[PDB]
Amino acid sequence: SGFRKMAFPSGKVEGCMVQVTCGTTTLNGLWLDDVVYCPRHVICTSEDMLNPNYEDLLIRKSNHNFLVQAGNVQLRVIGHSMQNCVLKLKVDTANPKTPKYKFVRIQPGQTFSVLACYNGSPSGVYQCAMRPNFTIKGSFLNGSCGSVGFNIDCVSFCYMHHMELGVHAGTDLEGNFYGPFVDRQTAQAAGTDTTITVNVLAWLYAAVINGDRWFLNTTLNDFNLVAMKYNYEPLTQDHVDILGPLSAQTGIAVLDMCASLKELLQNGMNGRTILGSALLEDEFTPFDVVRQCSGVTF
Amino acid sequence: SGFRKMAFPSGKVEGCMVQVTCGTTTLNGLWLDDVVYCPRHVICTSENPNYEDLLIRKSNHNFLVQAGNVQLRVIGHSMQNCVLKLKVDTANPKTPKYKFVRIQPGQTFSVLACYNGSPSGVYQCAMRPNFTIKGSFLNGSCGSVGFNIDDCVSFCYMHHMELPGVHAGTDLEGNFYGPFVDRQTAQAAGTDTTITVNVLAWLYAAVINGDRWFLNTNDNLVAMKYNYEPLDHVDILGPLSAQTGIVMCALKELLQNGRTILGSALLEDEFTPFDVVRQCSGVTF
Ligand SMILES: *C(=O)c1ncc(Br)cc1OCc1cc(Br)ccc1Cl
Numbered sequence: 001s002g003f004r005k006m007a008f009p010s011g012k013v014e015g016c017m018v019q020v021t022c023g024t025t026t027l028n029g030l031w032l033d034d035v036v037y038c039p040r041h042v043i044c045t046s047e048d049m050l051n052p053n054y055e056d057l058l059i060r061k062s063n064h065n066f067l068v069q070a071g072n073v074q075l076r077v078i079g080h081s082m083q084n085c086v087l088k089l090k091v092d093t094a095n096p097k098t099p100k101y102k103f104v105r106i107q108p109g110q111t112f113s114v115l116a117c118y119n120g121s122p123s124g125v126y127q128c129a130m131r132p133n134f135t136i137k138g139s140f141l142n143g144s145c146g147s148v149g150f151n152i153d154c155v156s157f158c159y160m161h162h163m164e165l166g167v168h169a170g171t172d173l174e175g176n177f178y179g180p181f182v183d184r185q186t187a188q189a190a191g192t193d194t195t196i197t198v199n200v201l202a203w204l205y206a207a208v209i210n211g212d213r214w215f216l217n218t219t220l221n222d223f224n225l226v227a228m229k230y231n232y233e234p235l236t237q238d239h240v241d242i243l244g245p246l247s248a249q250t251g252i253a254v255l256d257m258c259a260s261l262k263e264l265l266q267n268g269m270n271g272r273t274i275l276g277s278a279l280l281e282d283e284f285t286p287f288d289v290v291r292q293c294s295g296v297t298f
Numbered sequence: 299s300g301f302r303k304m305a306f307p308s309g310k311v312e313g314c315m316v317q318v319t320c321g322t323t324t325l326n327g328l329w330l331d332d333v334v335y336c337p338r339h340v341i342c343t344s345e346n347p348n349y350e351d352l353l354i355r356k357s358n359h360n361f362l363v364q365a366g367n368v369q370l371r372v373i374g375h376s377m378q379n380c381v382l383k384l385k386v387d388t389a390n391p392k393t394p395k396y397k398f399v400r401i402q403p404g405q406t407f408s409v410l411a412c413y414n415g416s417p418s419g420v421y422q423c424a425m426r427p428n429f430t431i432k433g434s435f436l437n438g439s440c441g442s443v444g445f446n447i448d449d450c451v452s453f454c455y456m457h458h459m460e461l462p463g464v465h466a467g468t469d470l471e472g473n474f475y476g477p478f479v480d481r482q483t484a485q486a487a488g489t490d491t492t493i494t495v496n497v498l499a500w501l502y503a504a505v506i507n508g509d510r511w512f513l514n515t516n517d518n519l520v521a522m523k524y525n526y527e528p529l530d531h532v533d534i535l536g537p538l539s540a541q542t543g544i545v546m547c548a549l550k551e552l553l554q555n556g557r558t559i560l561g562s563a564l565l566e567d568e569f570t571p572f573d574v575v576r577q578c579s580g581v582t583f
Pocket residue numbers: 025026027041049140141142143144145146161162163164182183184185186
């Protein structure tokens with residue numbers, strides 16, 4: 001019973017979070033095996049961030065300029081290299097707490113948990129979606145850079161935080177930004193954002209599963225005309241296929257739930273609520289809904 | 299910036315979760331030092347328990363405790379209120395510094411939702427004024443715990459039962475929160491009001507993050523009509539008043555008139571003043 005925005009348990013990620021200092025600049029880094037990953041802007045001074053020349057700033061750095069602490073212990077750095085927008089510090093000890101892990105680039109509309117960190121120490125954990133425009137609506141203060149996002153006994157790291165634009169932007173663990181962003185203190189346009197349609201649909205399924213059925217009353221090509229109108233992502237057959245399991249478990253056909261949603265979009269909610277929300281929620285994937293509704297564990 | 303319902307990091311609790319089996323009943327237990335804690339209804343079959351009689355028919359070896367692959371050896375069992383305490387022959391080497399704490403209504407904690415001794419997820423809950431919680435709890439989640447962290451984990455909640463709707467449980471001494479008992483009967487939770495001091499803390503969080511529009515001066519008279527907990531609550535809200543230069547209750551206009559605040563089309567009451575400050579200033583653990 002109940003339905004909650006639920007983060008993954010964070011223990012395996014917590015044992016990977018270290019502090020990285022370079023100059024006055026300090027942020028979080030991710031220690032897996034003998035490599036520490038962090039945003040390359042750890043090397044920028046106050047004046048550098050407006051237009052940093054990362055190649056030329058890194059040239060002025062030596063291994064011993066990088067202070068890496070994993071708790072009270074200090075790691076010694078035996079090599080440094082830049083891969084796109086992430087710095088990779090080789091250190092002489094492999095992390096004993098390294099989990100089984102992969103590095104993944106998620107697709108827009110996919111969700112992950114963020115372990116917000118400061119000075120290499122965890123502060124909290126929360127579930128996020130990658131917006132269609134490759135920003136994320138998170139909770140990130142000064143110093144949170146290098147906090148990571150992930151999905152789970154194997155941790156798939158998908159996101160490292162790099163900058164607050166009120167929305168947030170960063171990279172995969174190969175240092176490639178999500179979206180058009182660059183790592184410089186400039187104004188940068190995020191796209192026109194849209195609602196993640198397949199996720200709203202999944203969340204309506206969760207609603208029906210938990211007893212909220214008041215909204216239950218089209219064609220794919222026709223629903224998409226409505227979706228386009230309300231700045232919703234178009235629905236593809238791939239999305240319909242991924243909604244399969246929930247359609248079977250609940251016994252409502254996906255194009256039927258789509259007619260329900262069209263009505264919600266064209267008519268609003270009349271001050272009613274769905275799963276305790278007065279807006280349509282789009283930060284649950286069809287996997288998340290299934291995960292939670294069936295209690296899968298890690 | 300930004301503002302999210304944030305759960306505490308769960309690692310220190312994950313190392314404490316175990317599977318407890320009695321008969322053909324399995325749920326979650328909490329292994330700290332040489333003691334495993336779980337709901338005493340682990341000893342109940344499917345067929346109004348007399349727990350003392352049921353426990354009397356149970357011996358130490360009828361309780362199977364697993365920590366991952368390791369199986370612990372029970373060497374003692376007492377019942378304190380509604381918790382079973384199984385003394386095991388092994389202290390948990392992953393026991394964190396910890397306290398047992400009984401929270402007050404309107405306070406918040408993190409739930410590490412678990413099935414068969416294994417972590418499913420973590421989320422932030424508020425103890426509702428009527429001593430239920432609105433969580434996400436399936437059959438099997440019993441024994442999952444609620445907690446706050448300060449290197450010290452304060453356990454405040456053990457899950458005992460899904461009501462028709464919401465959730466109920468105990469403190470780690472086995473005393474239920476609220477008027478509930480560990481029996482499968484219809485049990486009423488009283489009317490549940492809104493946590494006024496929490497909604498105010500959330501409005502400060504909103505102002506800190508730039509949501510300004512809702513700013514427009516006993517007159518509690520309105521709170522009573524809209525079923526809000528009566529507004530000492532000012533003293534707790536002090537530091538937010540000092541940070542923003544704003545005690546705001548004139549929320550009155552919100553209640554009577556009804557756009558979004560911090561991305562919600564509802565007034566939110568599951569952030570305590572402490573939560574807002576922790577989050578808006580980067581408290582770590
Ligand atoms: C970002 O989270 C962050 N935290 C701490 C510190 Br010392 C710096 C930092 O980044 C600042 C930043 C990065 C970028 Br790519 C663009 C603008 C800014 Cl202000």
